């Protein structure tokens, strides 16, 4: 898909972006939800990651 | 300020508690409640 190479290609003059929006002029941050607080904030991160636990290789009798 | 949140402490010394609201111009609360640590109904008294 080579965009912006004519109308009959199906991807010309806009390259699948739309018409004059933030998503056409610039870029939207990936973590952005429009202003609504994400769940990781309204709920918080749960628990902790154990940095001292041993990583064992599991071997079954089977 | 008219209402305060009190803490009713288990007299089984398990550390469990209940929280209820009652006016300031009222006697402290004292009730018979269930303690899930000992799994029996014991006496609960206000903290202060």
């Amino acid at each position: 898909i080579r965009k912006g190479r004519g109308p009959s290609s199906g991807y010309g003059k806009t390259a699948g972006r739309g018409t004059k929006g933030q998503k056409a002029h610039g870029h939207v941050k990936p973590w952005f939800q429009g202003g609504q607080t994400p769940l990781i904030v309204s709920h918080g991160r749960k628990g902790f990651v154990n940095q001292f636990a041993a990583d064992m290789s599991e071997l079954n009798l089977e | 300020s008219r209402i305060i949140n009190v803490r009713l402490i288990s007299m089984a010394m398990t550390g469990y508690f209940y929280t209820f609201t009652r006016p300031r111009t009222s006697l402290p609360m004292s009730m018979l409640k269930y303690d899930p640590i000992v799994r029996r109904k014991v006496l609960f008294l206000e903290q202060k």
């Binding site: 990936p30 973590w31 939800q33 994400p38 769940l39 990781i40 709920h43 918080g44 991160r45 749960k46 628990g47 | -």
Partner: protein
């Protein structure tokens, strides 16, 4: 619990039920109906008392003495699962649960 209904019925004057006709009514009857047993012999219910019975610690041995079958059977409540078909999870955090957005897993994972 099972209800054990004790019924006492009155026979009309000079109406003596036959000992054999009484034992034949129970020969091929697994669902006893007091309604049918009453109209056939023309009885009238006058007295009544009741007591219940449920599974107890002694129910197992009692069935053994009298050779009653069914003690090796337990009943569990029938479960009615949800009638709604599965759907796709919705939301900003739910769409980004796959390895594609691994750079954004700091916002999608371990959420309280």
């Amino acid at each position: 619990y099972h209800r054990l209904n004790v019924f006492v019925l009155e026979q009309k004057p000079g109406a003596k039920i036959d000992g054999e006709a009484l034992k034949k009514h129970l020969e091929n009857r697994e669902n006893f109906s007091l309604k049918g047993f009453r109209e056939k012999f023309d009885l009238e219910p006058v007295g009544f008392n009741l007591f219940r019975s449920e599974w107890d610690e002694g129910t197992a041995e009692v069935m053994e003495r009298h050779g009653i079958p069914g003690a090796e059977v337990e009943f569990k409540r029938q479960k009615f699962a949800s009638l709604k078909p599965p759907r796709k999870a919705r939301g900003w955090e739910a769409k980004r649960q796959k390895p594609k957005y691994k750079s954004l897993w700091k916002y999608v994972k371990r959420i309280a």
